[PDB]
Write a protein that binds this ligand. Structure first.
Ligand SMILES: Nc1ncnc2c1ncn2[C@@H]1O[C@H](COP(=O)(O)OP(=O)(O)OP(=O)(O)O)[C@@H](O)[C@H]1O
Ligand SMILES: Nc1ncnc2c1ncn2[C@@H]1O[C@H](COP(=O)(O)OP(=O)(O)OP(=O)(O)O)[C@@H](O)[C@H]1O
Lengths: 573, 572
């Protein structure tokens, strides 16, 4: 499909084909030895035979290694391009996976699987292109030559020996696959435990549990080491068996050649021809058994890695899915029944209406499942029963991209890229201008703060934005979501980490930006949302109350009681 | 350390010597062939030489492969144990590093460096132990036997050839180290970018920026691919140069021997002997080249890892540091000046007293440095000026372990292990019993909730505990700190994501058991902490006000102002 890559692969194949010329170099030494022993010296060609033998041998070895390295240097571009394309596809498809995977994944084992599969595919492609075909050509050439100069019984013996070789290799590989899989699993578990400890370094320091993490990693490492010892011992046993088979076959061949006659067909040269061809045959078959085991391992690793990527995507677009068109940002929950796992149901027929352009609050006790409303509105999961509508359009029947582009959310636990503040803020919109970033930072009340910083927008935030304060991180999230500027805006506990001045500023910003935008604010402090158009009270995953602040307060229900418990702080300390 | 591996390693060395014996066994079989050319054949006496040829050659090759695999099978345990010990030490020292490193690290590149070093130490140890010594033995044996059997010229030529080989290898390695380092840096950067995107999957989905992350990772990957192509091309050039040198040396060695006489310069069998020795001499040098370059690369990589593992730990114990003795859990900040970076200072002479057993709140605007008080109280950093005292004892002069064991913290951003709820709760104390876990879950108001769960304590929380609710996660952190049961307890905005009922229940359950325990609560909502014994107001890193809620409200200071802004009723 690529003319450059085609040409490169053709050149590489020519390079391996030159291996056949290298194999043809040995019969030159055969002929020279035959001449030297048939004339016994005293003739003219002896000086010629010596010079030709030394020159041909040295140049043949040098040309073999030179062609191997030229093949490597010419194929390195194609190999690295294949690795890059595989890595890009794996990354892209890894970002397409469902949220349940990322929420319950273990970084160490998935990283081990990804790297092992990528390296196995690289090695497998390399060996498939550069080992399979030349070894077949060499086997056919050996068969033909052995048929012309060794008869038929010897070629049948060699075929029976390679058949026994294949049978023993298959049996030992079937025995060793279990140990290999156990080793890989233990390695993955060890790396996952180590990565989890590194992610919880702060917790370990808080609880002084360095020794416990070290001990658990040491236990995992000892398990992996024992499994690896077992696997490599089985590999050594396989190699010893294969070498025994090949060496006894070679011994039989040499025995037949010498037993034919003390002088043989040719006194000097027959032994040398046989030994050279048998070296050129034992060197590749001893590695060919390993190459069969390597193809097996690469197949099981491709099957392993591919069994993880693109295998379980919870949310997928329906065929010919149209794009979402939001003319009126209205939200409808129609008898939505949903639970994260079928073991525990979270939402039991939740139904409500959020009018277009209104500011609606969602309150309730902990565990009520408001973040469930936020995640289902974003189509991270699909509800068991009922449906979600935006402008009267089913969320499940519209493309994910348009739906998620019509929604902006300031989540409860926000994560920032390991980059500058300006990058994180401009991440809200592709190619955001500095004027939009400045306007959003003014709206998110970090303008003066960024001005007081030495690097300004170029201030580093570190990994996950932990080099900033909580309020600064929350304001950065608000700023990026304002950069996005979607028609529907969902604040999941936005004003938790904010001080009083920032709290009032962000609240006024939310009230001012609610002009033609629907606003859904999940808050634990009722006073911050008492001015909302409607307040939805959740309890155990059900809509207990709905209405204005005065309406829910007059009903003397759950919202009123909650408002009488929070207001107890100011009335009487 | 006693005979654990000694016998085993001795066996490995024995195997290596047996390999030399095999290498010495082959020329003898050739010597017999020389005899077969001096006796002119025979009816029966030729058969002996034939049988000797077949037996010696076949058994020599089979025994070589068998001894190699036996050496591997006996040394695999030692190799895996060495790799395991190095990995354990690397992990331990990685946990010993300062918090400034972990806060500003990049996971992908550090993980890549660690894994590269882990594989490199194994490969390097194998090649060093099984190539360096046998190649030296073979070179010395070839030198002595040759010197005995040809004179001086060819040994002078061989030593000059090895000197030129070493010089060319050194030059090409010095030229290729730059490309290798650039390739490694690009690989680390690409992996770091990919890991950051995987950590921010949720942000990417929130803003639909999959294409941008894919494009940036593709750019990093193509850069790494170009660097790797250059490095491997230079490697191929080095290999062809080395092979040319060795093959020309072999060719010259054969040419000198043949020029003496057609059958033999000194002895007739010396030419076949020489060519066999040249094969047995090229077999180890083809490994010696890659072993030289691999030892160089492994040393420079492990030094690079250790130059990142041996980075200076900001917080270290003073020599002969005593243990902390907390009889009255009081906290004192004495003119503490500290900033994270010298370009921006955070705390400017902060001084305050938190009495033993009192309930103290820490409030103020953003940037006032309350999380700095929490991080410095735990000695994550050391202050520029001033000091911190616990029960009148300097934090800087006590062991880190006792200090951190005397303090429990529910941080603002809590992280949970990717494990069950019971594991996370019992993590508060080493070997926590089930009764203690139950008592803490009851105190943290998650007992009944866990009872309502299908798996109960065995419910998975996922990575960082994101499979739980915010309030559930905060209460799990509270449960861990209650399991630890320290005399000083610091809540950095702990009860924000809790509803009022659960918050009040937990706080009252604490207050009942809050006897002789210091409580330090950092809160942004003042009304939740108006019942504290004392309230410390911070501004620009200084203690502006201190006192009760009624006192600070009557004083009409900063606390009153902050309390009058939240009290603004926006309800219609
Ligand atoms: N990925 C998940 N897997 C399993 N259960 C989940 C997952 N996400 C949420 N839940 C469950 O759904 C319920 C709702 O929790 P959620 O994260 O919605 O917090 P909330 O109740 O909305 O508010 P708060 O943070 O105050 O508790 C909880 O019981 C929680 O255990
Ligand atoms: N790890 C860090 N590295 C560098 N600078 C930091 C770090 N953490 C915070 N800062 C900066 O220094 C100031 C120190 O305040 P810190 O975040 O420690 O607590 P705080 O000011 O009480 O937070 P809040 O904003 O919740 O009041 C912060 O406002 C922030 O600008």
């Amino acid at each position: 499909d690529n003319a450059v890559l085609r040409r490169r692969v053709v050149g590489a194949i020519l390079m391996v084909l030159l291996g056949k010329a290298t194999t043809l170099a040995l019969p030159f030494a055969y002929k020279k030895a035959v001449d030297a022993m048939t004339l016994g010296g005293g003739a003219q060609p002896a000086l010629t035979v010596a010079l030709a033998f030394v020159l041909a041998y040295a140049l043949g070895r040098f040309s073999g290694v030179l062609f191997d390295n030229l093949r490597n240097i010419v194929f390195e571009r194609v190999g690295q391009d294949a690795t890059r394309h595989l890595a890009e596809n794996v990354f892209a498809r890894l970002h397409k996976l469902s949220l349940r995977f990322h929420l319950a994944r273990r970084t160490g084992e998935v990283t081990k699987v990804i790297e092992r599969g990528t390296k196995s595919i690289d090695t497998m492609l390399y060996f498939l292109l550069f080992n399979i075909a030349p070894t077949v050509i060499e086997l056919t050439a050996v068969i033909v030559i052995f048929w012309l100069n060794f008869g038929l019984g010897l070629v049948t013996a060699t075929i029976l020996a390679v058949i026994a070789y294949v049978w023993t290799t298959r049996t030992i590989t079937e025995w060793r696959t279990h140990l290999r899989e156990k080793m890989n699993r233990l390695d993955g578990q060890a790396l996952a435990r180590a990565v989890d400890s590194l992610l919880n370094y702060e917790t370990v320091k808080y609880f002084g549990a360095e020794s416990r993490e070290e001990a658990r990693y040491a236990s995992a490492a000892r398990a992996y080491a024992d499994a690896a010892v077992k696997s490599e011992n089985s590999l050594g046993l396989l190699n010893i068996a294969q070498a025994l088979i090949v060496n006894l076959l070679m011994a039989g061949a040499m025995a037949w050649t010498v037993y034919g006659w003390s002088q043989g067909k040719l006194t000097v040269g027959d032994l040398v021809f046989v030994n050279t061809y048998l070296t050129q045959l034992f060197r590749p078959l001893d590695m060919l058994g390993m190459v069969y085991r390597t193809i097996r391992q690469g197949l099981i690793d491709m099957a392993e890695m591919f069994r993880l990527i693109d295998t379980h995507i919870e949310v997928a677009d329906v065929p010919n899915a149209p794009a979402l068109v939001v003319n009126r940002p209205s939200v409808t929950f129609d008898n939505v029944v949903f639970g994260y796992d079928r073991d525990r149901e979270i939402l039991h027929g939740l139904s409500f209406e959020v009018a277009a352009g209104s500011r609606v609050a969602i309150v309730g006790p902990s565990g009520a499942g408001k973040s469930t409303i936020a995640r289902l509105l974003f189509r991270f999961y699909d509800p068991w029963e009922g449906r979600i509508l935006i402008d009267g359009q089913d969320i499940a029947h519209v493309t994910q991209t348009s739906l998620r582009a019509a929604l902006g959310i300031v989540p409860q636990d926000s994560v920032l890229f390991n980059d500058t503040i300006g990058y994180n803020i401009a991440y809200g919109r592709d190619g955001a201008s500095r004027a939009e970033v400045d306007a959003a930072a003014k709206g998110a009340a970090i303008a003066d703060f960024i001005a007081r910083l030495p690097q300004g927008y170029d201030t580093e935030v570190g990994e996950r934005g932990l080099k900033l304060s909580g309020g600064e991180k929350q304001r950065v999230a608000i700023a990026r979501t304002l950069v996005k500027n979607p028609p529907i805006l969902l604040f999941d506990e936005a004003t938790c980490a904010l001080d009083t001045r920032t709290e009032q500023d962000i609240l006024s910003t939310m009230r001012a930006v609610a002009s033609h935008r629907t606003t859904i604010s999940i808050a634990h402090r009722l006073s911050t949302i008492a001015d909302s158009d409607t307040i939805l009270v959740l309890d155990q995953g059900r809509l207990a109350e709905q209405g204005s602040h005065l309406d829910l307060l007059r009903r003397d229900g759950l919202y009123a009681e909650m408002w009488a418990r929070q207001a107890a702080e100011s009335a009487e300390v």
